[PDB]
């Protein structure tokens, strides 16, 4: 038969499942809704583990339970009472014999030890992957240290001693590849000559590589804490989502730099060279699976100042028109082809973050926090699982590093790019549009001629890499 349980009067997690406290979706069950007690029971269930439930729960629980209250509840879960001796044990003891204690031993082995281990696994994952709760609440960390540091008994000892050390490490807190990264490529600008660095003087291969390293690092830095609760859209977004905002602002700045390079090149022939070079950079972004970079270029070419430059587009080689058009097709029909391509490539890659943001926001706005059933309010956990499926996808692409060498000067050049200067956004984007009107006036105004501005060769070195011995 099943093991008997402690009385639900002394141990709240032994209350029977009912539709008043847990609802399952239609071989482990999937939870649609439940009380916080039932969610924690199933998070630490004696019969199994959904390995992904711990991540889902720890990513999303603050929408329904405060960190201090979660710690109290899992400590309560951990402290399981042992059953009293059975009749057979009683009779043995009355005869001076040692009891077999069969039911007690089974309850320890099959209920207490698995539940306690799974509570400790929640603690371990909490400290390792969601440590911000403890960075933001020193007293929460004290409580966790005291709880772990006072667990007695040999069955849990290895993990208790380990978690104590992990916490101490986290308080005061290296990549290997088989192959070597390719050689850094140089064009007109030579190593160390940062004052000559520019769109046409750096090698287009190396522009794309160094931007991919930068954009990959920015992508990898975004934590789920910056996303859950849609906090990057709220009044405190600069406090709660700083890595996400840095990532987006880099993307916006690079897009605007591409636009500025184009429309400030008033000579038509030179501007064709600029646009062609940016499409070559897009080709290398595609080869590197840097989809953020791909869309940085596509966004620039579809901006109002650039898109209208018909005389420039006419002179772009047909093969490059095709590269740009196929890149743009990734975004069509609500990113249908982008989503399929992302799911088909071999990482490393840099996803476009914007789709994830819209899907997290709409999942949070479009589903209720609670479900009302039989007069009770149950936490709508299905909504939280949907959010954590998105944050899980984000994290999956954050794991794989690029096998590319950093060039510190080129990296600094792109980190310090500031096309808007001290201008405000509207002032600057109106400036770009007025430059577009200057260099290619609206019909029927005639097309003017403009002097060259570049003193160095405009011929591209191309985007196929070179390899000396």
């Amino acid at each position: 038969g099943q093991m008997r349980l402690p009385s639900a009067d002394v141990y709240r997690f032994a209350e029977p499942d009912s539709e008043e406290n847990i609802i399952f979706e239609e071989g482990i069950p999937i939870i649609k809704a439940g009380t916080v007690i039932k969610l924690i029971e199933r998070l630490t269930y004696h019969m199994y583990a959904d390995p992904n439930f711990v991540r889902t729960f720890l990513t999303t629980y603050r929408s329904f339970c405060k960190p201090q209250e979660l710690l109290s509840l899992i400590i309560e879960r951990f402290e399981i009472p042992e059953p009293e001796p059975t009749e057979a044990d009683r009779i043995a003891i009355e005869n001076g014999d040692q009891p077999l204690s069969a039911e007690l031993k089974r309850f320890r082995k099959e209920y207490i030890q698995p539940v306690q281990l799974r509570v400790l696994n929640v603690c371990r994952h909490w400290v390792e992957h969601h440590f911000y709760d403890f960075e933001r609440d020193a007293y929460l960390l004290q409580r966790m240290e005291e709880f772990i540091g006072t667990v007695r008994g040999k069955a849990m000892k290895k993990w208790v001693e380990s978690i104590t050390k992990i916490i101490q490490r986290k308080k005061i807190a290296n990549i290997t590849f088989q192959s070597s990264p390719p050689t850094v490529e140089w064009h007109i600008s030579r190593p160390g000559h940062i004052e000559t660095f520019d769109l046409l003087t750096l090698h287009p291969i190396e522009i794309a590589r160094q931007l991919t390293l930068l954009e990959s690092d920015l992508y990898r830095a975004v934590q789920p804490s910056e996303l859950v609760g849609s906090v990057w859209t709220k009044e405190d977004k600069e406090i709660n989502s700083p890595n996400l905002l840095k990532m987006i602002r880099h993307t916006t700045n690079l897009t605007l730099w591409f636009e500025k390079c184009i429309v400030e090149t008033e000579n038509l022939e030179e501007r064709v060279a600029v646009v062609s070079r940016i499409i070559e950079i897009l080709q290398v972004f595609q080869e590197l699976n840097n989809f953020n970079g791909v869309l940085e270029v596509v966004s620039a070419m579809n901006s109002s100042p650039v898109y209208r430059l018909d005389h420039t587009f006419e002179q772009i080689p047909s093969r490059q028109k095709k590269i740009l058009e196929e890149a743009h097709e990734l975004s069509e029909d609500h990113y249908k082809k982008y989503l399929a391509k992302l799911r088909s490539i071999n990482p490393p890659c840099v996803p476009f973050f914007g789709i994830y943001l819209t899907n997290i926001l709409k999942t949070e706005e479009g589903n209720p926090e609670v479900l009302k059933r039989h007069g009770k309010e149950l936490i709508n956990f299905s909504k939280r699982r949907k959010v954590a499926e998105i944050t899980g996808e984000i994290q999956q692409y954050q794991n794989q590093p690029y096998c590319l060498r950093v060039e510190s000067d080129i990296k600094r050049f792109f980190e310090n790019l500031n096309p808007m200067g001290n201008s405000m956004e509207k002032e600057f984007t109106d400036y770009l549009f007025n430059k577009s009107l200057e260099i290619e006036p609206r019909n029927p105004k005639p097309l003017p001629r403009f002097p060259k501005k570049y003193s160095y060769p405009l011929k591209s070195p191309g985007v196929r890499p070179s390899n000396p011995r």
Partner: protein, 167 residues
């Protein structure tokens, strides 16, 4: 066969803009949504006896990608310009959204509606007369909507489709 209308929702972030399209496309009578689902933003409707397909682009959450707005906007035939009735800044933003739409579409007469959205019970700061006066100065309709009761939601989208049909 039936006409497809490409509609674009624009407006300030952080103030409940996404509720407009969610409430339209939703199972009207079950409060649920999965935005990742292929065609969670397409809806067949009958407007003035004529069946059509609405394709709605709402990039809510991507407001900080400001250099992508031009490309997103150019996809649209008609625009819902949304502000929150308890957020005066979102109302003051409307002028620049409309100017940007006109530039991107290269037209002084783009089908559009002004939508004032009640996203919570916080106090209204934009009176309906202010928004009506703004919409009249632009020559466009004004619709007010609730982010919670679905009131006004159909009217906002159907009014925009009528603006497209009568352009």
């Amino acid at each position: 066969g039936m006409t497809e209308y490409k509609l674009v929702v624009v407006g300030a972030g952080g103030v409940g803009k996404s509720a407009l399209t969610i409430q339209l496309i939703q199972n009207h009578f079950v409060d649920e949504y999965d935005p990742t689902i292929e065609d969670s933003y397409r809806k067949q409707v009958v407007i003035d006896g004529e069946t059509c397909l609405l394709d709605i682009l709402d990039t809510a959450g991507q407001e900080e990608y400001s250099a992508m707005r031009d490309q997103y906007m150019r996809t649209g035939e008609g625009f819902l310009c949304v502000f929150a009735i308890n957020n005066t800044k979102s109302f003051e933003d409307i002028h620049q959204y409309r100017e940007q739409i006109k530039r991107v579409k290269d037209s002084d007469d783009v089908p559009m509606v002004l939508v004032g959205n009640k996203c919570d019970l916080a106090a209204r700061t934009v009176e309906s007369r202010q928004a009506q006066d703004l919409a009249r100065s632009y020559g466009i309709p004004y619709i007010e909507t609730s982010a919670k009761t679905r009131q006004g939601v159909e009217d906002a989208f159907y009014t925009l489709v009528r603006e497209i049909r009568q352009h």
